[PDB]
């Protein structure tokens, strides 16, 4: 059980770190940008999806403690 | 110069991560090889004991016995490490590179091997080993294959010694027996211990000495046979020196004289004696009471005791060979330990 | 590597990666999920590991078995 728990914690932690660096990269790309409207809308949708993923993954890391 | 006695305190301490099993001596340079229970083979240098020269892991299981010999062709060094992984390994030392160089691994044993020996008689190097397979096995170092496999005992042999064409073998069935090397015939059998034989070795010739009572031959038969007295160490807390009888000289066993004779018994150890090594007049032996004792051949009494040498069991001792003129008997002797330490005495 | 440690008795070196994994090269155990900060070793051998996950886990190394077993965590 501790091996399974450690594997899940490592997986979700490396996923959250990659997601945070992806948010940083997308924010930097959007700041550089600020077809133009199309990629701006794509960046906005990616920001919204990444924010939703970050919210649900902070929720699941909250419940791993429980 | 052959009556050197080591001092009370250890010269320096060698740190090993696990249990030390077998310790050998380099006959040319002050280099000690230290075994592990984990199977790692070390090579420490006596002047700088900080880091090993070559820490090579060779076996997944423990290693039990070693032998080392500097060959004399008509040259280099051979290290053999008998192990618990159903096989033995052979190593060659490179002085220029200071690293272990593997040669070959000899197979054939159907259980774990507990003894190994290497020697030369006439321009041919042979390797012997003995295992829990109840059979004494022999090998040719240059060829690589065996020559003769035979069982001398019902139970399993533990330790051996050899010179020329004669092999004796201590056994788990508390009996000693000479096994002839070419013929494979048991010349004589011995009884008198009450426990399995831990280590056993021959007592050989010396050239000049004031007076000897346990190495010199008596008659011309002893003089030309060259095999007179042997000492056996067994788990009954006793060390005994055993008279071997004459054969009916392939030599034949003597029907009325095929029995060994115990001459002198030594006692005083608080646990099982583990290894012995004769050096001139002094019989150096260990035990499992955290001590190493020094026994005299003549008076049969322990002159010096090294109490609390380790905090655990003392496993193996080894000296420099003294009955040959090729290697001088330098004043160096190193012990092992169950408590992950090794101590060497110098000067 | 975020920290480096060496065995004071035997020729062994302990390496801790930036991802939290600890490797013992003359074993691979993840003592902490987050990135470790620093380590200290004192001679039984006890290794104290501290990370940014608000949890400090202490692990001990078995020399005979060549494996690391955790004892307690703060």
- In contact, B149 and B136? CB cutoff 8 Å: yes
- In contact, B320 and B13? CB cutoff 8 Å: no
Which candidate, B228, B227, B232, B301, places its Cα nearest to that of B273? B232
Q: How many CB pairs under 8 A join A and C?
A: 9
Q: Is the dihedral of CA B187, B193, B196, B199 positive or negative?
A: negative
Q: Which of B15, B37, B51 minimises the CB distance to C64?
A: B37
Task: Look at A14 and C34 and tell me if their CB atoms are within 8 Å.
Answer: no
- Residue B5 domain-assigned (yes or no): no
Backbone discontinuities in chain A, residue before each (C to N > 2.5 A): 34
- Residue B1 domain-assigned (yes or no): no
Chain C residues in contact with B41 (beta carbon < 8 A): none
- Residues near A20 by beta carbon (within 8 Å), at least 6 away in sequence: A54
Q: Phi first, then psi: give them for residue B233, nearest 5 degrees.
A: -120, 125
Residue A48, Cβ density class (10 Å: 0-12 exposed, 13-18 middle, ≥19 buried): exposed
- Residue B3 domain-assigned (yes or no): no
- Residue B114 domain-assigned (yes or no): yes
Closest CA of chain C from A5, distance in Å: 11
Domain region containing B232: 11-347
- Residue B245 domain-assigned (yes or no): yes
Quote the CA–CA distance of B276 and B286 in Å, as a whole number: 7
Residue C70, Cβ density class (10 Å: 0-12 exposed, 13-18 middle, ≥19 buried): middle
- Residues near B216 by beta carbon (within 8 Å), at least 6 away in sequence: B206
Q: Which helix (DSSP H) or strand (DSSP E) does residue B82 occupy?
A: strand B77-83
- In contact, B101 and B94? CB cutoff 8 Å: yes
C19 CB within 8 Å of a chain A CB: yes
Q: What is the number of domains present in chain B?
A: 1
Chain C residue closest in CA terms to B55: C11
Chain A residue closest in CA terms to C31: A6
Q: How far does Cα B148 stand from its chain's mean position?
A: 21
Q: Which of C7, C11, C64 minimises the CB distance to B38?
A: C64
- Residue B188 domain-assigned (yes or no): yes
- Residue B144 domain-assigned (yes or no): yes
- Residue B4 domain-assigned (yes or no): no
Identify how the structure was determined.
cryo-EM
């Amino acid at each position: 059980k501790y091996q399974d728990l450690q594997e899940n914690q490592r997986f979700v932690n490396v996923g959250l770190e990659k997601l945070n660096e992806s948010v940083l990269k997308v924010n930097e790309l959007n700041k550089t940008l600020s077809n133009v409207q199309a990629n701006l809308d794509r960046s906005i949708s990616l920001v919204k999806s990444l924010t939703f993923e970050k919210e649900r993954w902070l929720n699941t890391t909250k419940q791993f403690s429980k | 110069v052959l009556k050197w006695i080591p001092r009370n305190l250890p010269s320096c301490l060698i740190n090993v991560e696990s249990s030390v099993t077998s310790v050998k001596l380099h006959p040319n340079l002050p280099i000690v090889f230290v075994a592990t229970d984990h199977g790692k083979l070390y090579a420490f240098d006596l002047f700088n004991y900080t880091i090993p020269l070559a820490s090579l892991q060779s076996h997944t299981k423990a290693i039990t016995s070693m032998d080392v010999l500097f060959t004399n062709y008509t040259n280099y060094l051979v290290i053999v490490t008998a192990s618990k992984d159903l096989q033995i390994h052979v190593f060659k030392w490179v002085s220029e590179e200071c690293k272990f160089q593997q040669i070959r691994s000899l197979l054939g044993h159907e259980h774990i091997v507990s003894a190994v020996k290497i020697w030369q008689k006439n321009n041919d190097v042979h390797i012997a080993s003995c295992s829990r397979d109840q059979t004494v096995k022999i090998w040719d170092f240059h060829n690589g294959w065996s020559l003769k496999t035979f069982q001398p005992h019902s139970q399993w042999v533990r330790s051996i010694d050899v010179l020329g064409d004669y092999i004796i073998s201590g056994s788990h069935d508390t009996t000693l027996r000479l096994t002839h090397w070419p013929s494979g015939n048991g010349l004589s059998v011995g009884t008198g211990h009450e426990f399995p034989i831990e280590k056993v070795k021959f007592i050989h010739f010396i050239e000049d000495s004031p007076e000897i009572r346990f190495r010199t031959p008596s008659t011309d038969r002893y003089k030309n046979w060259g095999m007179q007295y042997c000492v056996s160490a067994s788990r009954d807390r006793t060390i005994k020196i055993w008279e071997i009888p004459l054969p009916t000289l392939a030599p034949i066993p003597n029907p009325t004289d095929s029995n060994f004779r115990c001459v002198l018994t030594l006692k005083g150890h608080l646990s099982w004696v583990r290894d012995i090594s004769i050096r001139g007049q002094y019989l150096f032996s260990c035990a499992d009471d955290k001590s190493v004792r020094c026994w005299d051949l003549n008076t049969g009494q322990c002159l010096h005791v090294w109490e609390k040498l380790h905090t655990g069991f003392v496993n193996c001792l080894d000296l420099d060979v003294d009955f040959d003129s090729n290697v001088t008997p330098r004043q160096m002797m190193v012990t092992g330990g169950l408590d992950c330490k090794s101590n060497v005495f110098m000067r």
